[PDB]
């Protein structure tokens, strides 16, 4: 009595995603995640001036280009042998941090929320699933249902302006957005002025107010209606993080620290243990066993027998690991926002001080949204601090020369998860460039040993009581905030 459901396009993610599930006895029993679009940035990059990479790679994704820019300029800093100044480091963090706020807000409202909030009766808010299990369906008190739905929809609409203001903040020192000009090998291209720091700060305070007063309360309220969604969309419960927003010039300390959590145990992150498999991916590898990114190969082959995705399959110590705010917040285990502490008590009867106090609830559909909202607040606290640390007038750029032969790796966390760019230079040109991105870790297919990717695995057990309105499939997928442009590049 198995039924197959195929969803292509899985909309309200970035890029081209197909999801297939098998359903039996009202639950998902198997799943496949497929990325159907390829560009091959790693091929396009070969033979170029290595400095061009920090512009080229941004075009992997117009939602997270600052993450790719950051990873690229860090790879170049490493390869070129240049150290960024204090003010350069802080300026890079302000450019990138403003897009963390943009990206999380864009995701929750403009990608995720239409699985919960009933929009107006005009395109693109309709058509929608007939039985969509929305706030207006779940909340049985009609006035409360209307009021809660209107509350959520008004925030969706206001968030359109708030996310635009975040891009004003990115452009302040980044030049424009999408696709900044302001980050380069050696630092940042425009020294912050007192006036422009103040103009960034004024906009930031408006964003921060929305985060604390509107976004966090909505997420906790939403979770209190959908308590069942803290109990499904579980997956491997393995997470990895690389470290993001270095807080000192030697990159020893970060806002959110590197680390790995596998099978209930914390360990340090060791980049030597990252490798990619391609057994079910449209790529040829010169050797079996998975390849470390430093010898990565990008030889597309859409005819590869048994393959079903343009996404490669990264594993850490041969384990699937997921990435993103859940991963970073679990690894760092920061103190929860005051709003979260309060609303967990008031709305759920939960006493929680630190993220891990959520326990099992963290590894779920709603847990992923909570992690993302809490991280938005945590990032805002950091930006508020960086705005005091940044020094008007202080040099942000250090000169460098393209080396003949070198290698460098830039490590960071994109809003959606762990990100590195590996750069190898020969005869002053890009010899190899290998990108291991965030959604790559989440939306990958099975590896050579048949181990499902994290989204595939997290789909197992998801309830589908109505096969014609399989709303929880998309809810699980969107909780990961997938970017398929990033996943495939």
């Amino acid at each position: 009595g198995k039924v197959k459901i195929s969803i292509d396009p899985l909309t309200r993610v970035e890029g081209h995603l197909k999801i297939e599930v098998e359903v039996k006895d009202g639950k998902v029993v198997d799943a496949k995640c497929s990325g159907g679009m390829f560009r091959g940035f790693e091929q396009i990059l070969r033979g170029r001036d290595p400095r061009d990479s920090s512009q080229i790679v941004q075009r992997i994704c117009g939602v997270c280009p600052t993450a790719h820019c950051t990873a690229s300029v860090m790879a170049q800093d490493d390869a070129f042998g240049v150290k960024v100044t204090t003010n350069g480091r802080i300026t890079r963090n302000l450019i990138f941090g403003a897009n963390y706020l943009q990206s999380h807000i864009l995701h929750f409202y403009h990608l995720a929320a239409l699985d919960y909030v009933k929009g107006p009766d005009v395109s693109p808010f309709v058509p929608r699933y007939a039985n969509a299990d929305l706030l207006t369906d779940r909340i049985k008190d009609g006035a409360k249902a209307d009021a809660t739905n209107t509350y959520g929809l008004n925030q969706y609409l206001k968030a359109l302006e708030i996310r635009r203001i975040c891009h004003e903040m990115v452009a302040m020192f980044g030049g424009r957005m999408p696709h900044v000009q302001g980050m380069v090998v050696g630092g940042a291209t425009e020294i912050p002025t007192a006036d422009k720091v103040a103009e960034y700060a004024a906009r930031f305070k408006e964003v921060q107010k929305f985060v604390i007063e509107e976004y966090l309360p909505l997420i906790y309220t939403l979770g209190s209606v959908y308590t069942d969604l803290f109990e499904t969309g579980i997956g491997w419960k393995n997470v990895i993080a690389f470290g993001v927003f270095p807080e000192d010039d030697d990159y020893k300390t970060f806002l959110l620290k590197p680390g790995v959590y596998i099978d209930g145990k914390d360990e340090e992150f060791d980049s030597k243990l990252v490798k990619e498999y391609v057994g079910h991916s449209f790529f040829d590898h010169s050797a079996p066993g998975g390849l470390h990114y430093s010898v990565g190969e990008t030889n597309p082959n859409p005819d590869k027998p048994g393959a079903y995705s343009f996404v490669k399959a990264p594993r850490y110590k041969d384990k699937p690991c997921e990435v993103g705010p859940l991963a970073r917040m679990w690894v760092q285990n920061p103190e929860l926002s005051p709003v979260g502490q309060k609303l967990l008590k008031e709305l759920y009867g939960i006493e929680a001080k630190n993220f891990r106090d959520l326990g099992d609830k963290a590894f779920s559909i709603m847990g992923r949204h909570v992690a993302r909202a809490e991280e938005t607040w945590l990032t805002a606290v950091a930006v508020e601090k960086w705005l005091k640390q940044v020094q008007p007038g202080a040099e942000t750029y250090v000169k460098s020369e393209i080396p003949d032969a070198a290698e460098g790796t830039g490590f960071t966390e994109a809003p959606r998860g762990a990100l590195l760019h590996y750069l190898k230079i020969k005869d002053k040109k890009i010899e190899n460039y290998q990108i291991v991105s965030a959604t790559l870790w989440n939306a990958n297919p099975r590896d050579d040993m048949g181990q499902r990717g994290p989204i595939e695995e997290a789909l197992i057990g998801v309830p589908v009581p109505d096969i014609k309105n399989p709303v929880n499939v998309g809810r699980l997928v969107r909780s990961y905030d997938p970017x398929l442009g990033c996943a495939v590049h």
Binding site: R39, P127, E190, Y397
Partner: protein, 279 residues
């Protein structure tokens, strides 16, 4: 107050053209969506998914045949029978599955459209996906139309990404033309099909650093004073109104911040590279 019907499709794109559109002001995106256009299909933001989303797209393309704008973000890959870009899956009168390539989608929808508008340098000119080293046979809308022998009014709005003012302005001008063609002639296009309204000015000729350029005052590094020419600025070979309009609601622009990389031009990126070597 009849809104312009829009079907927005993505090929080999990065969603940056969409994100830039979300940054519109005067009007802002809320007013664009509720008052200016009917955004009927858009994979990044629409409520429906899969079968329902595609069925709706095709129903609109039928009901509004010859009366919707086909907006294209991203390039069209033609290698390997189009299989480098699968945009969806369709189901027959029987129960079977058929993948739809970007080639198939554009071949289908373009003849149904009132006009096609290629937003961004990828769709207009090939851009980064079509740059040296790619193996996907990545192609622009104009080249795909030429290969397919499709004659459909086509307007290009390039940039990587384009400014929201360029996209909104062009779409509004096109819709005004359709509603009253003699009161609102179509914007004059250059040889590369982009409106002179936005792409007629040369950046360099209109640049506030031109006095410095003329006096040979060149910035030694990004954070020194002077014209940006020695840092790689492609303003001299680039045609857009960025010097006037600036970016992100007037907050900054590429030349003030750093350099112009010529992102609106049909030879972007290869003809504008290396980015940090002077023209």
């Amino acid at each position: 107050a009849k809104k312009a019907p829009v079907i927005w499709v993505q090929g080999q794109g990065c969603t940056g053209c969409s994100v830039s559109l979300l940054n519109a002001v005067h009007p802002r995106i809320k007013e664009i969506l509720l008052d200016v256009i009917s955004l009927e299909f858009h994979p990044t933001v629409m409520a429906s998914e899969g079968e329902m989303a595609l069925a709706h797209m095709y129903e609109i393309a039928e009901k509004f045949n010859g009366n919707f704008f086909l907006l294209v973000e991203g390039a069209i890959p033609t290698a390997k029978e189009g299989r480098y870009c699968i945009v969806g899956e369709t189901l027959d009168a029987k129960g079977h599955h058929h993948e739809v390539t970007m080639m198939e989608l554009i071949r289908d929808l373009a003849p149904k459209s009132l006009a096609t508008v290629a937003v961004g340098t990828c769709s207009a000119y090939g851009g980064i996906p079509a740059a040296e080293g790619n193996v996907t046979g990545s192609k622009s809308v104009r080249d795909f139309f030429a290969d397919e022998k499709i004659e459909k009014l086509l307007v290009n709005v390039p940039g990587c990404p384009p400014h929201p003012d360029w996209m909104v302005g062009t779409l509004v001008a096109a819709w005004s033309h359709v509603l009253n063609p003699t009161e609102h002639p179509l914007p004059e296009l250059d040889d590369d099909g982009r409106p002179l309204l936005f792409f007629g000015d040369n950046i360099h000729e209109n640049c506030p650093y031109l006095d410095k350029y003329d006096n040979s005052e060149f910035a030694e590094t990004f954070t020194k004073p002077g014209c940006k020419a020695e840092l790689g600025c492609k303003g001299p070979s680039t045609y857009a109104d960025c010097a006037k309009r600036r970016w992100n609601n007037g907050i900054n622009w590429c030349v003030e911040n750093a350099v112009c990389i010529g992102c609106v031009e049909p030879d972007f990126p290869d003809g504008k590279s290396p980015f940090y070597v002077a023209e």
